Structure formats: structure tokens, C-alpha cells
Write an enzyme that holds these catalytic residues in place. Structure first.
Site, PDB file in Angstrom:
ATOM      1  N   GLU A  41      -4.221 -21.287   8.077  1.00  0.00           N
ATOM      2  CA  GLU A  41      -3.869 -20.988   7.504  1.00  0.00           C
ATOM      3  C   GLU A  41      -2.086 -21.467   7.950  1.00  0.00           C
ATOM      4  O   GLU A  41      -1.491 -19.958   8.201  1.00  0.00           O
ATOM      5  CB  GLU A  41      -3.558 -19.631   7.348  1.00  0.00           C
ATOM      6  CG  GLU A  41      -5.096 -19.365   6.048  1.00  0.00           C
ATOM      7  CD  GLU A  41      -5.263 -17.993   5.661  1.00  0.00           C
ATOM      8  OE1 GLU A  41      -4.416 -17.314   5.750  1.00  0.00           O
ATOM      9  OE2 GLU A  41      -6.303 -17.915   5.025  1.00  0.00           O
ATOM     10  N   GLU A  98     -12.982 -20.363   3.743  1.00  0.00           N
ATOM     11  CA  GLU A  98     -12.638 -18.727   4.077  1.00  0.00           C
ATOM     12  C   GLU A  98     -12.538 -19.114   2.271  1.00  0.00           C
ATOM     13  O   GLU A  98     -12.102 -19.324   1.252  1.00  0.00           O
ATOM     14  CB  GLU A  98     -11.721 -18.744   3.949  1.00  0.00           C
ATOM     15  CG  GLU A  98     -11.192 -18.954   5.651  1.00  0.00           C
ATOM     16  CD  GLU A  98      -9.636 -18.194   6.215  1.00  0.00           C
ATOM     17  OE1 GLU A  98      -9.844 -17.012   5.596  1.00  0.00           O
ATOM     18  OE2 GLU A  98      -9.121 -17.773   7.446  1.00  0.00           O
TER      19      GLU A  98
END
Ligand SMILES: *[C@@H]1O[C@H](CO)[C@@H](O)[C@H](O)[C@H]1NC(C)=O
Ligand SMILES: *[C@@H]1O[C@H](CO)[C@@H](O)[C@H](O)[C@H]1NC(C)=O
Ligand SMILES: *[C@@H]1O[C@H](CO)[C@@H](O)[C@H](O)[C@H]1NC(C)=O
Length: 312
Positions: free
Chosen positions: A135, A250
């Protein structure tokens, strides 16, 4: 129900990256490694991928060009080997958000050096996946692409030629914002990340999707019954257009009826479009979650009884 229709189904292992205020930090106080027994249960159930999260600065202290810490690397290898010796995939994930000791990683050459080092330690393990960084956010879209490219080049230069390299976008690599969110240089993931090249042709586009209003994964409230599949749609179009494949690295919902229906609907979508989605990975397992609303850790995970059968 949704696994044998996926190349890769499994769980995040989160815990070795915890307590990042404290680097190096101390095992048992700031971070822990993974419960091989719990991972063994997931493997015998049919899951075949574990996203093993870690902290860059603990694996390679001081500078990105330095040597590894052998004890931290030791425990990584122990958990990786438990999984890959049983035929499941072990994804190595520096959980650093594009930042090294707090500072944005601005040097693609530092990044290539880091990845050439980490990949050398695992170059002969064909069941290892490398995840360039978790991320990226608050950065220029072009630097994030260039960092991802620097990682591929570092990994192959070390001789790790058999492994898939998971490349992650800017803006928390969100699927739903893949064509919309812009970096500080005004450019999107759609606009920068299609250029990535690999001499071994094994780039897996690694996206994340959560179902609350702002996609943070912060609220137990999922937007609505189809919010999961609907948010995958723009990214699915993009992937087919540029002939790329991806994994949903995710995702999670809370234990309530709407989140449940939204999660299965999404995983159904992924099966429907398995030409570009190779699988999905739940966030998260790991032993230090307690009552975390997304924890699927078998012995005390509040989400386990509900979503462990859905994954499976
Ligand atoms: C490890 O996982 C097993 C299987 O889920 C569980 O029964 C056990 O309590 C766990 N051990 C620790 C120390 O969390
Ligand atoms: C590695 O794991 C062992 C437990 O097997 C623990 O005693 C040790 O402190 C850990 N070290 C690191 C650096 O994770
Ligand atoms: C859920 O909300 C999204 C966001 O606008 C929308 O696109 C979608 O159609 C909604 N689904 C339902 C079933 O209302």
C-alpha cells in the site's frame, strides 16, 4: 466454497510488522512471528497462499543497501519453509507503505538493492512470491511505478527467476480507485502501472478492496449488499484491456449479514472473472489480533467461524 475456482486462496499473516515505532523493536513485545500450527490448519483445509507481512527496517537495518538481519530473516525463512514445504505459496510482504524509517522511498536504486538482497535469500524457492511493498500512498504515481519496476529488476538480477512478483499501486493499491485516485503528480495507477516489464513475464497486479464507505477497512458497516463486486468492476475492465492478471491481496468484511453477502458476492465475481483475477487473500490471520473484527486466526478470531467456510 470459493477456493478450487481460484489459483490462490488464503490469508494474510500479520504480526511481524507490528509496533513500527520501535525499530528494531523486540520480539514478544513489539512484534511476533506466525503460528505454524494455525497455518497448518489453513493448509489442510485447502488454502494455498499466505501473505507473510514484515517490516523492511527489521529485515534490512540502517540502509536499504545493507545486509540482512540474520535472526529476523531466520524467522521469516522458518515460517516460509513451513508453508512452502507443504506445497502452499509464501508471499514475502514488506509492510512499509513505500516508506523507510518514516521517509518516502525516493531512490529506486535503494529499492532495487533492497529487493536484490531479499530475493537472493529465496531465489531457489519456486513457491515464494515477492510483494514489492504494501500500500504505497501519498506519493507520485510515476515513482510508485518506477519503484515497482526497480523491484522486479532487483529480484531477477539476484537470480530469483521462477517467482511471481506482486506489484502494488499507489493510493493503498485500491481496486475501486484504480482509474480515479491520483498521486501527487496527478497520475493514476491505471495511467502509470501498465508499463511494468519482467524478463520472466511473471507480474501479478496486487490490489486491495474493503467495503466500508471510504474503503479504509475501518468500519464494521459495509456499504451495501453488492459493494464488493461493484468496486472490482473498473479494475477488472482495466486488467482485460491491457492483458494483465491480478490477485486481490487484501479484503475483509465484518460479521454481519450485509458484509457477508457482499463478501461472497465479490468472491463470486472473482470466480466469474478468473481470466484476470487469480485469487483473493483475506485480511487477516496472525496471533496478536485478539478481538479484531477481521481476524480469522482460528483460536480467537471473531471472523473465523463465519468467513473461514466462505474462503474455503
Ligand atoms: C496456534 O494455533 C492453534 C491452531 O489454531 C491454536 O489452537 C493455538 O492456540 C495457537 N497458539 C497460540 C500460542 O496462539
Ligand atoms: C525468532 O523466533 C524465536 C522463536 O522461535 C524468538 O525467540 C526470537 O526472538 C525471534 N527473533 C526474531 C528476530 O524474530
Ligand atoms: C451499492 O452502492 C454503490 C455505490 O454507489 C452502487 O454503485 C451500487 O449499485 C449499490 N448497490 C445496491 C444493491 O444498491
Amino acid at each position: 466454497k470459493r477456493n478450487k475456482k481460484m489459483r490462490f486462496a488464503g490469508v494474510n499473516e500479520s504480526g511481524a510488522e507490528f509496533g513500527s515505532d520501535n525499530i528494531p523493536g523486540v520480539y514478544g513485545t513489539d512484534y511476533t512471528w506466525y503460528n505454524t500450527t494455525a497455518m497448518g490448519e489453513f493448509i489442510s483445509q485447502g488454502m494455498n497462499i499466505f501473505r507473510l507481512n514484515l517490516l523492511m527496517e527489521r529485515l534490512v537495518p540502517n540502509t536499504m543497501t545493507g545486509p540482512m538481519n540474520a535472526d529476523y530473516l531466520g524467522n521469516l525463512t522458518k515460517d516460509v519453509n513451513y508453508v512452502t514445504d507443504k506445497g502452499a505459496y509464501a508471499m514475502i510482504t514488506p509492510h512499509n507503505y513505500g516508506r523507510y524509517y518514516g521517509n518516502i522511498i525516493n531512490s529506486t536504486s535503494d529499492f532495487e538493492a533492497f529487493w536484490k538482497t531479499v530475493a537472493g535469500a529465496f531465489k531457489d524457492n519456486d513457491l515464494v512470491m515477492f510483494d514489492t511493498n504494501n500500500e504505497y500512498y501519498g506519493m507520485a504515481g510515476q515513482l510508485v511505478a518506477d519503484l515497482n519496476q526497480a523491484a522486479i529488476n532487483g529480484i531477477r538480477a539476484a537470480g530469483a527467476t521462477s517467482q511471481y512478483v506482486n506489484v502494488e499501486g499507489n493510493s493503498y493499491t485500491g481496486a475501486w480507485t484504480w482509474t480515479t485516485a491520483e498521486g501527487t503528480d496527478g497520475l493514476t495507477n491505471a495511467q502509470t502501472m501498465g508499463n511494468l516489464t519482467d524478463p520472466e513475464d511473471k507480474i501479478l497486479y496486487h490490489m486491495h478492496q474493503y467495503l466500508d464507505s471510504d474503503g479504509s477497512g475501518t468500519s464494521s458497516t459495509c456499504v451495501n449488499s453488492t459493494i464488493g463486486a461493484t468496486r472490482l468492476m473498473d479494475a477488472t475492465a482495466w486488467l482485460k484491456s491491457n492483458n494483465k492478471i491480478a490477485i486481490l491481496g487484501e479484503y475483509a468484511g465484518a460479521v454481519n449479514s450485509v458484509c457477508e453477502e457482499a463478501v461472497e458476492g465479490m468472491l463470486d465475481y472473482i470466480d466469474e472473472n478468473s481470466d484476470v483475477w487469480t485469487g483473493a487473500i483475506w485480511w487477516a490471520a496472525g496471533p496478536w489480533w485478539g478481538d479484531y473484527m477481521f481476524s480469522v486466526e482460528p483460536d480467537n478470531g471473531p471472523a473465523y467461524s463465519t468467513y473461514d467456510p466462505i474462503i474455503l
